Design a protein around this nucleic acid. Structure first.
Lengths: 83, 147, 128, 163, 103, 56
RNA sequence: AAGCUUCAACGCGUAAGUUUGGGUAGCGAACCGGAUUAGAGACCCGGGUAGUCCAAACCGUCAACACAUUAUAGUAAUCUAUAACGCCUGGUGAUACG
């Protein structure tokens, strides 16, 4: 199994280094200590194993304002797993 | 040009060919797969059922035969019973001969040694194929070494 | 019927940015030192099982006076049954099997056992 | 005398025929393998299933009103069908090798069941409320020619034994 | 497969024919390529409950055990052997493992 | 108490009259033996054979 | 990967019921007898036939419920993403035809 270490707050805890992560525990200034739960919020599979969806990128922009703030995960053969 | 499987050859100088073509439906944004059947002229009757053939439009020969067979790509291997008995003979001859030559070395030890060295010879061969194709390099990517 | 969520710094934050009012006075406390709210769920019940259980089961089955030491719980000095089991186990990882280790532990810690049985007979004459 | 008693103990004569058929089952696994001790290749699978359905079909003209592992009899027949129809696509020479050694027909799938170019001899059966064994018997007779031979042999045997 | 048989026997007959009865069962398991391991009786025990609703035989009945290794074909003749004789009432035949862990 | 040999398969009167048989021609149930329940069920089977047997 | 699902088809299917054969410890529809009450056909007291018992067949429907589809992936789900499904579309009205 592959154990993701979920990013609980609005910082990654590089001095934590929660298992795997970025090498070297040095950000410059220490940050806020927020108590927010788990920031990937209400992730929606918009492709779907029955219906694949191509979004030609202007349509991707116009449906990016249809949904809340966040980054699509996308595929393209020349670029691989992209945003 | 269609590349589609045959399904029928009971039929004089004519094979029934089925092709997987995918139609759009606009209502649900889902590509639905249907399969349509075509009748196609062949000339040599070399198409056994299960062959992957290339049909193309030519002059119509009938009311409903409209394509002509160009090339059979992957041949469907077929059940020949006497040849199957020949494979029985060769295969149990190989098994009994290998066990007699082998038969302390229990025969699993000898065969698994041979499979290990066969895999090692394979890995040396494809590793040297990578060596002649690339040169001394980390297997990071070939896309990096394509420069 | 709403749901329990994040606490007090996301709850102060979206007020405190706008200049609503001045903070509860411990803001420097709330920011300079890392917390953790009990993000409460079960990633797996960690019932991490003690290896000393079969040795202590056998030693308490064979010498039940090893239930009867006085023992200081709050100092981390080990009791006699623990040196029994640790001696048997260090002979195990030395390479020998379990029963020969049990015999060597019977030879190498019996002295405190007769000292303890003398002490228990003294307490027996004290009580009766 | 006492060693003769030991060898008459260790024989396969004394065992229950569950254990007797299991010992000849690893005799069959020593036969059908490609290999020294391969027990999971699909030829081993279909050899076990074909032999298994042969002693169970003897048991099941003997017992008719059995119902619980007749589901298991269906499970062997269907998984054997899956194994041949996979193995023809996967390794054809092993497919032909096994259904020549066992002697079985072709059971692969408005269609044709992979006949030749010419000489298109055919065998298709489609209809134009049953009990169990009255239907599960002729299918298992139908795909397997050895069982059809056993059927006609025991039919002649009973007709000349009653006469 | 070795088969124990803690079977009953008639209580007080003269032993000239119960021994012959066990000779007959020994002859029956003697056939079919197998033999008795040990014939251990328990002498006699008075029973716990009456049997033979016809003829009212009664308790004080006799006990015998066979312990024989047999192929499964011989059981039907053994069923006849324990069924036809009215000198015996009950018979319990149990399989036992090849570790020879008998009663 | 749970010594397997002579108790696991053995139908004779002694072990059962000691720890398994109620006095009035009946048996001692699960709560009055404190023994592993599958092994208890199989020796209860052995005892309940022995209530079909000429003994008991 | 021979895996998942089951449109179609097909089997299993508690108990009643019918055809066939008998005879039957107990169980308990009819038929007659009496009771709370005005009539009482029921509850309850009283005998008790087919059926419950057997062996073969037909029927296949039901608060047949985890009312928790099946399967995979997570820590026994009603926490829920998916794969194939089956079913619903305000109520009363599903019975009649085929």
């Amino acid at each position: 199994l592959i154990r993701l270490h979920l990013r609980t707050d609005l910082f990654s805890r590089l001095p934590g280094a929660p298992g795997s992560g970025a090498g070297g525990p040095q950000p410059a200034s220490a940050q806020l200590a927020p108590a927010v739960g788990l920031l990937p919020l209400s992730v929606k599979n918009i492709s779907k194993a029955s219906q694949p969806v191509l979004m030609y990128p202007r349509q991707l922009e116009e449906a990016a304002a249809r949904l809340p703030a966040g980054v699509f995960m996308c595929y393209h053969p020349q670029l691989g797993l992209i945003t | 040009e269609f590349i589609g499987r045959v399904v029928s050859n009971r039929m004089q100088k004519t094979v029934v060919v089925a092709v997987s073509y995918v139609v759009w439906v606009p209502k649900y944004k889902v590509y639905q797969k249907r399969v349509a059947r075509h009748k196609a002229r062949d000339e040599s009757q070399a198409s056994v059922i299960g062959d992957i053939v290339r049909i193309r439009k030519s002059r119509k020969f009938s009311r409903e035969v409209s394509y002509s067979v160009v090339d059979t790509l992957r041949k469907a291997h077929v059940y020949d019973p006497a040849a199957a008995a020949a494979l029985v003979a060769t295969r149990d001859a190989a098994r009994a001969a290998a066990a007699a030559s082998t038969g302390r070395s229990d025969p699993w030890v000898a065969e698994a040694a041979r499979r290990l060295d066969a895999s090692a010879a394979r890995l040396a061969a494809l590793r040297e194929l990578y060596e002649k194709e690339v040169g001394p390099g980390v297997p990071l990517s070939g896309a990096v070494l394509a420069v | 019927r709403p749901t329990r969520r994040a606490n007090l710094v996301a709850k102060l934050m979206r007020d405190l940015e706008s200049g609503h009012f001045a903070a509860p006075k411990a803001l420097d406390v709330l920011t300079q030192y890392r917390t953790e709210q009990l993000s409460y769920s079960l990633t797996g019940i960690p019932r991490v099982t003690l290896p000393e259980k079969p040795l202590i089961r056998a030693f308490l089955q064979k010498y039940p006076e090893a239930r009867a030491e006085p023992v200081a719980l709050d100092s981390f000095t080990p009791p006699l049954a623990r040196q029994f089991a640790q001696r048997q186990l260090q002979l195990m990882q030395a390479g020998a099997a379990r029963e020969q280790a049990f015999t060597q532990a019977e030879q190498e810690l019996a002295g405190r056992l007769q000292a303890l049985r003398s002490r228990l007979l003294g307490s027996a004459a004290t009580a009766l | 005398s006492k060693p003769d008693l030991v060898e008459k103990l260790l024989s396969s004569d004394v065992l229950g025929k569950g254990e007797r058929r299991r010992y000849e089952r690893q005799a069959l696994i020593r036969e059908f393998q490609r290999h020294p001790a391969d027990t999971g290749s699909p030829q081993v699978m279909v050899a076990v299933w074909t032999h298994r359905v042969r002693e169970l079909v003897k048991h099941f003209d003997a017992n008719r009103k059995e119902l619980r592992p007749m589901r298991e009899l269906e499970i062997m027949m269907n998984q054997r069908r899956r194994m041949l129809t996979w193995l023809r696509r996967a390794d054809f020479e092993s497919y032909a090798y096994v259904i020549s050694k066992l002697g079985l027909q072709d059971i692969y799938t408005x269609x044709x069941x992979x006949x030749x170019x010419x000489x298109x001899x055919x065998x298709x059966x489609x209809x134009x409320k049953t009990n169990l064994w009255q239907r599960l018997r002729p299918q298992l007779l139908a795909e397997d020619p050895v069982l059809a031979a056993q059927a006609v042999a025991t039919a002649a045997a009973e007709k000349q034994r009653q006469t | 497969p070795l088969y124990e048989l803690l079977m009953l026997a008639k209580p007080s007959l003269p032993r000239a024919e119960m021994v012959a009865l066990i000779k007959g069962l020994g002859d029956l398991v003697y056939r079919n390529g197998g033999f008795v391991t040990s014939l251990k009786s328990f002498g006699d025990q008075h029973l716990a409950y009456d049997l033979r609703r016809p003829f009212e035989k009664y308790d004080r009945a006799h006990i015998w055990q066979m312990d024989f290794v047999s192929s499964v074909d011989a059981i039907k003749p053994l069923d006849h052997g324990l069924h036809v004789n009215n000198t015996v009432l009950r018979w319990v035949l149990v399989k036992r493992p090849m570790s020879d862990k008998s009663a | 108490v749970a010594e397997v040999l002579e108790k696991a398969d053995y139908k004779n009167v002694a072990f059962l009259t000691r720890w398994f048989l109620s006095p009035a021609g009946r048996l001692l149930p699960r709560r009055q033996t404190r023994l592993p329940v599958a092994v208890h069920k199989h020796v209860s089977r052995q005892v309940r054979l022995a209530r079909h047997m000429g003994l008991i």
